[PDB]
Design a protein around this ligand. Structure first.
Ligand SMILES: [Mg+2]
Lengths: 294, 415, 131, 112, 34, 51
DNA sequence: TAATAGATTAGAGCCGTTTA
RNA sequence: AAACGGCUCUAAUCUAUUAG
């Protein structure tokens, strides 16, 4: 079970972009179930498989397949080992490019089930993110778009707001999947189409990051799509702007070549690099760039 | 005469010209982009003359701000004007405006009368417009090129401004008992007794019995609770709890709505054991599903609920969880529960997961929604409600119609 | 009836400054933002793994169709979409002939010696794991 | 910008345009006529555009039956419309009805 | 020390770019000033 | 004195092919001895240099 | 320390490849 | 581990309460 992530963690010290390919993936026709069709049926998505593999290769080879069109989206994920918080940050530079580095150095909360940052760890995380933004765009970000899969406690938000510089309104977003709102369509046989946002509160909403697509004439999700709960539990911001920025973050999935994913890519990449970091022993000053992780 | 000519500003408009050239070549049309088809050596001006006059079908001039003043493109455009006069064909020249820094009031007179095809900020939709024009004027493989053709048009498919109505998952609680009662069974209720085994929903909270039922309802299984003074029980109106206006050192608000939530869940659990439906223990909650053969042709209201799949049987089941954050609602969750022959549940859960995925391979929004609605209607006692026995005189009323939503933007369903 | 507001789908940049929605269409139409000159693939796996990777790389170089092209776009071939050379004849191959730790250590030492000792430059190491 | 422009049919309608031009210079106003001032051995359309949108107070359109349908007059009047929009000058476009043959309806919808 | 600091500046620029930056670099041409 | 050696040594752990190019090499014409020809006369060897 | 609930959260597996 | 989703299972924590 712990082969890929451990291998990436071991290779992390000396930066080596590595892409792990299962032998059953490239040649899925050779290996079967010994009584019929192959174990992995890639016939319908072979072109999609090549799309994803080529995109990942071009990304790890130092290429930028697609960009996005003064706000730092800092999405952090908590991992169970002591709990380790590992973050991925994204923002736009002066030259219109999308700086999509990581925010690595997973900060360790010693409490077993408290997926929250201690004041010192939260201070370190936010000052690292702000220093990265300052060195990249030569100035402090207007508004850091901190987000996570968990609700922020009072103490870590106070630490964030006391470490932040002036004129930097910081906003926290809690993005949760598997919330049971199976909204259907009564007339047609085709599900709700991707992009619908249900404003259930001025701070909390249901965002349909995935669903039916007019362009693909089909659905990103099998069955009925599951909306993702977007809660602005901390910070002051408009719900519509938050949903728009979440859908914007839903496009940077370089690890795949897909229209969009059910969750913002920042959270997913932070979770992946956190799994890599926690797979093996500690690494001082880790690479912090997803070509070495995904 | 079957050939497309693309004149352009050579020094600073190459990239679009090449992209359009290979795109048109991939579409089957014959192109004469100069930087891609002009042979080395040949007299370039004489060859351009020959192409424009002898075999060019249509002339595409780029209207970039660097162009419209370049001598070469101007000369090819003058020859194109001459061939337009000779051929007497409308819109032989089809200008393309890729630059956004020039206005339509700065275009040279030779093509100012003709309408420029929009390429300002979207080359692919501009190419779709250009190909629409080419089809209109009948400009001059049978499987590969149609994919690119459809991709050009489908790259910009969007949401049509149409109104759509949605059946959601939540079911509103139309009415509820007005009073939540904490009975004082300090010694009447056994301390090692299980409250979940009560025939009616209650919880042992703070050495009180919190319930929606009357104090004398818990008699058959709790005989010693009889002869209980009604003054000891403390009663709080449910409306105050739901509105959040009630908050006391006795019970906090959040605890109070958590208590009524778990009361609703327990009421559901104790109700469906009566509603002629068997249960399946999922990891987090219980799913209620009807056995095979208990429904006429295994359908309720023109929607089937149990059927045959690969020698085994599938049953549509639901799981309930009440929540009160936006409003008092009951969230439902759909599942497929799998059996040997509709009577015997499958013990192994890996086979259950595999069979659930297999049955969910081809089930979609219409099937899921119709089956959920049919199951909810089958559980219903009256026409538009489901009764939960929270009290011998008080019942929880669950609506039959889920929370309907509506939207201003939607799609055209592919056929 | 509750109003489901609409969030318009954002568009992502591509080559020449153009914007599209699906990567699978923006790449096929215009191509990636920055230009690399090619991918010198390094493969750390068995001989059968190298053969399988070579065969699939040659298959990638030519366009490959989905079963239903409308919903999921075609792949026009690596050179067509990225404009970059990723040929199978430029492969740096490192043949291999607590169990988790040792299995990791095999590929790890191969890659470390390759990146340190050997002179051939590799941009991305394709660890073709067996099954 | 200080000039007066006269657009017309070139083969047929020359006498009136030439007479009007010469009278206009006699009065002191500057004119640019394609049969008088358009120099030989130049880019005639390029200079026509440069004169329309660089030095032109007024743009006069002789409205003979053939001139209205004439392609050169149509292009000249189209860029005249564009420059009229640009300069915001009122009544920058002046038609001249010289033929009793064509009626009010017969004139092309632009200059009606 | 001065050699150490001057080396360290170009150094940590190179490691920060090799670790953080997405773009691949085949060879780093340290244009040493004069 | 030991800039190049130290720089190449400190890059050895994280394998990074580095080439140190002096400014006085790449654009030798600009830097002049303040009284005449450039301090490094590469005119005879330019191609070789490039080589 | 154990139990009974709801709300959050995290982990892994397992199957299908998104109705034309 | 090309990848994204649907589901399934498990565990933990935070509240409040009861028995230790
Ligand atoms: Mg990856």
């Amino acid at each position: 079970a712990q082969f890929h992530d451990q291998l990436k963690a071991r290779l992390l010290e000396h930066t080596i972009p590595t892409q792990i390919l299962r032998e059953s993936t490239l040649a899925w026709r050779d290996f079967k179930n010994t009584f019929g069709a192959p174990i992995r049926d890639f016939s319908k998505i072979e072109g999609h498989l090549a799309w994803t593999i080529s995109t990942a290769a071009y990304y790890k080879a130092g290429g930028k397949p697609w960009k996005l069109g003064g706000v730092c989206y800092l999405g952090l994920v908590y991992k169970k080992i002591q709990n380790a918080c590992c973050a991925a940050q994204m923002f736009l530079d002066n030259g219109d490019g999308t700086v999509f580095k990581g925010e690595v150095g997973p900060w360790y909360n010693p409490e077993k089930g408290e997926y929250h940052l201690k004041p010192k760890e939260a201070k370190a995380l936010l000052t690292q993110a702000l220093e990265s933004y300052k060195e990249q765009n030569k100035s402090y970000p207007k508004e850091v778009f901190i987000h996570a899969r968990t609700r922020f406690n009072d103490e870590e938000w106070n630490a964030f707001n006391e470490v932040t510089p002036k004129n930097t309104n910081l906003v926290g977003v809690t993005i949760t999947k598997s919330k049971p709102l199976k909204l259907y369509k009564t007339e047609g046989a085709f599900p709700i189409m991707r992009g619908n946002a249900y404003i259930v509160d001025e701070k909390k909403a249901f965002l349909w990051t995935l669903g039916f697509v007019p362009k693909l004439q089909s659905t990103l999700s099998m069955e009925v799509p599951n909306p993702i709960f977007i809660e602005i539990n901390k910070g002051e911001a408009e719900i519509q702007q938050v949903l728009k920025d979440i859908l914007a973050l839903t496009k940077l999935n370089y690890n795949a070549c897909i229209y969009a994913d059910g969750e913002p890519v920042t959270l997913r990449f932070a979770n992946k690099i956190g799994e890599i970091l926690t797979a093996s022993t500690e690494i001082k000053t880790p690479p912090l760039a997803f070509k070495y992780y995904i | 005469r079957n050939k497309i000519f693309i004149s352009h500003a050579t020094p600073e408009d190459d990239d679009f010209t090449r992209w359009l050239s290979l795109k048109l070549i991939g579409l089957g049309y014959e192109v004469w982009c100069d930087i891609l088809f002009l042979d080395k050596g040949v007299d370039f001006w004489s060859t351009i003359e020959k192409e424009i006059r002898e075999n060019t079908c249509k002339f595409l001039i780029v209207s970039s701000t660097a162009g419209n003043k370049r001598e070469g493109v101007l000369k090819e455009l003058a020859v194109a004007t001459k061939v337009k006069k000779h051929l007497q064909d409308d819109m032989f020249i089809i200008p393309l405006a890729i630059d956004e820094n020039l206005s339509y009031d700065d275009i040279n007179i030779e093509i100012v009368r003709l309408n420029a095809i929009d390429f300002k900020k979207s080359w692919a939709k501009g190419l779709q417009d250009l190909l629409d024009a080419f089809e209109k004027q009948n400009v001059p493989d049978h499987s590969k090129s149609n994919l690119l053709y459809q991709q050009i048009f489908l790259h910009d498919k969007q949401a049509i401004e149409k109104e759509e109505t949605y059946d959601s998952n939540w079911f509103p609680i139309i009415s509820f008992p007005n009073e939540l009662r904490f009975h004082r069974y300090d010694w009447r209720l056994p301390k090692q007794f299980d409250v979940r085994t009560l025939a009616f929903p209650a919880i042992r909270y703070k050495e009180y019995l919190c319930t929606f039922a009357w104090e004398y309802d818990f008699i058959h299984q709790l005989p010693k609770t009889e002869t209980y003074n009604g003054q000891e029980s403390i009663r709080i109106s449910t409306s105050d709890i739901l509105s959040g206006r009630y908050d006391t050192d006795f019970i906090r608000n959040y605890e109070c709505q958590r208590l009524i939530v778990q009361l609703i869940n327990k009421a559901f659990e104790l109700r469906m054991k009566d509603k002629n439906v068997r249960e399946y223990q999922m990891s987090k909650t219980f799913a209620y599903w009807i056995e095979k053969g208990k429904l006429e042709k295994d359908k309720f209201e023109k929607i089937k609920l149990v059927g045959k799949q690969k020698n085994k049987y599938w049953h549509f089941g639901i799981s309930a969880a009440g929540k009160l954050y936006p409003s008092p609602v009951l969230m439902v969750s759909s599942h497929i529960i799998f059996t040997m022959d509709g009577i015997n549940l499958i013990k192994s859960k890996s086979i259950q997961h595999s069979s659930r995925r297999k049955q969910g391979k081809n089930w979609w929004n219409d099937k899921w929604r119709e089956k959920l609605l049919a199951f909810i209607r089958f559980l219903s006692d009256d026409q538009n409600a489901i009764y939960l026995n929270v009290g011998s005189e008080e019942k929880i009323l669950i609506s039959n119609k889920p929370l309907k939503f509506f939207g201003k933007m939607s799609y055209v369903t592919p056929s | 009836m509750k109003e489901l507001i609409y969030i318009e789908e954002p568009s992502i940049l591509f080559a020449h400054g153009q914007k599209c929605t699906d990567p699978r269409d923006g790449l096929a139409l215009f191509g990636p933002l920055n230009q690399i000159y090619g991918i010198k693939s390094g493969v750390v796996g068995t001989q059968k793994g190298l053969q399988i990777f070579k065969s699939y790389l040659d298959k990638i170089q030519k366009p490959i169709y989905n079963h239903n092209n409308i919903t999921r776009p075609m792949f026009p071939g690596f050179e067509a979409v990225f404009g970059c050379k990723w040929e199978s004849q430029n492969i740096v191959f490192k043949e291999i002939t607590k169990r988790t730790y040792d299995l990791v250590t095999l590929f790890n030492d191969k890659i470390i010696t390759a990146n340190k000792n050997d002179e051939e430059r590799v941009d991305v190491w394709f660890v073709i794991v067996p099954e």
